[PDB]
């Protein structure tokens, strides 16, 4: 991460033994559960790319998904190189216009990542940009690992409505379907995949029943 | 480690009871898993060689690997002595041009390691250099301890593709094969060592299938 010192200067403070570890656990216990993405962002808020890398590295399992993340990171970095104009060379006094190897956190050091981040000319959030590219790779993994699909999440005869619903909304998040299509699934596929007796209870309510209405109505059905 | 005080001076702050211990555990629970190397680096970021030693020392088991690390540390130190010119003797006022016994953390004290580290003439990262030599010894141990080899990591008839892959990519890291050879193994040995039915699914995709493509395609095969 970064901390400030007398005179307006900035320095590299280290990442902590309880955050690297909590990330390792969130990735393992939850097995790239959708929540891994905000669990990562929060644990890395105020961090630099060097530590974001070390956190992801310390994880020693699910190394198939860590590679999917690495392929996604290299792709987003190749776009930053493609869109940026790589202007005329700058003097040694000045630091290299940050490139994709630099933000991804490989070619560059940690003191140059901070420099850009708190550079007066153009403070650049190298830490936030690399982290965003990762949320994409992590999100792809959540979906790649999703145990089921929302279409196949259906109420079991003795399964309760709320439990069936918990699975349905969780999958809707992880599958990361477009928001407009999420509204269609919630209002249609959920009356459709539910047991018939509970389905009739929701149908008895009328049209566009709110979830509070549906969850209350099929309570005990 | 090191902390600064009024007047621009530096002092030896101690290492903490939760870092020595977490390193001890990362080395034991993971049994020199590849992740031990970044787990060590992060736990030791801002540290001095004296503590890097005490951490490694506190570990009381896997003492065969701690000796491999010690042989690697003495070898890297003998190269620093071999390459450096041991210039003409300096006055008592000045501190000894750091040598290998000094960086390895034996002959020298902790106040002389910090002095060099924050020496105005040439701040020297004695802490980082010794730590790097160790990552080499730790990396050799990861490989010496690696339970299997990537060539023998093959999909079992009922084993799923992703689990076989997790082992393959993990071994690729620990065996630390050259990056060009890692690309060949990932694109060839993995269609080769996989079950035939799943192998045909990857072959049906075409040539150079990405992992997201392969991992998605053989899902349920």
């Amino acid at each position: 991460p970064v901390q400030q010192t007398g005179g307006g200067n900035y320095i590299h403070v280290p990442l902590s033994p309880r955050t690297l570890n909590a990330w390792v656990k969130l990735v393992e216990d939850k097995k790239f559960g959708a929540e891994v993405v905000p669990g990562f962002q929060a644990l890395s808020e105020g961090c630099t790319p060097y530590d974001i890398n070390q956190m992801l590295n310390c994880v020693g399992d699910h190394q198939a998904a860590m590679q999917i993340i690495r392929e996604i990171i290299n792709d987003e970095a190749a776009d930053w190189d493609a869109q940026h104009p790589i202007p005329g060379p700058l003097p040694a006094g000045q630091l290299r216009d940050p490139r994709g190897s630099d933000i991804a956190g490989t070619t560059s050091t940690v003191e140059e990542q901070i420099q850009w981040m708190y550079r007066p000319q153009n403070p650049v959030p190298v830490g936030n940009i690399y982290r965003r590219w990762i949320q994409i790779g992590l999100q792809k993994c959540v979906r790649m690992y999703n145990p089921t699909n929302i279409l196949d999440v259906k109420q079991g005869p003795k399964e309760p409505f709320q439990s069936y619903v918990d699975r349905f909304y969780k999958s809707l998040r992880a599958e990361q379907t477009d928001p407009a299509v999420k509204n269609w699934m919630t209002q249609t596929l959920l009356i459709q995949n539910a047991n018939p007796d509970c389905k009739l209870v929701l149908k008895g309510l009328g049209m566009n029943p709110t979830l509070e209405e549906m969850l209350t109505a099929c309570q005990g059905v | 480690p090191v902390q600064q005080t009024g007047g621009g001076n530096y002092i030896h702050v101690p290492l903490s009871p939760r870092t020595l211990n977490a390193w001890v555990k990362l080395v034991e629970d993971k049994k020199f898993g590849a992740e031990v190397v970044p787990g060590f680096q992060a736990l030791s970021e801002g540290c001095t060689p004296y503590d890097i030693n005490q951490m490694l020392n506190c570990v009381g088991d896997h003492q065969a690997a701690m000796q491999i690390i010690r042989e690697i540390i003495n070898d890297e130190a003998a190269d620093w002595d071999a390459q450096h010119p041991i210039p003409g003797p300096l006055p008592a006022g000045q501190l000894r041009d750091p040598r290998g016994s000094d960086i390895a953390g034996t002959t020298s004290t902790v106040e002389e390691q910090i002095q060099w580290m924050y020496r105005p003439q040439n701040p020297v990262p004695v802490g980082n250099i010794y730590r790097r030599w160790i990552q080499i010894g730790l990396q050799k141990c990861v490989r010496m301890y690696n339970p299997t080899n990537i060539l023998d990591v093959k999909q079992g008839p009922k084993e799923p593709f992703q689990s076989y892959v997790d082992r393959f990519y993990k071994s690729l890291r620990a065996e630390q094969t050259d990056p060009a050879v890692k690309n060949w193994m990932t694109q060839t040995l993995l269609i080769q060592n996989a079950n035939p039915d799943c192998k045909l699914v990857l072959k049906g995709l075409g040539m150079n299938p990405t992992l997201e493509e392969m991992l998605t395609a053989c899902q349920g095969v």
Binding site: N57, Q63, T106 | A174
Partner: peptide, 8 residues
């Protein structure tokens, strides 16, 4: 190479 998939 190394046991560092990400970074240097």
């Amino acid at each position: 190479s190394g046991v560092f998939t990400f970074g240097a």
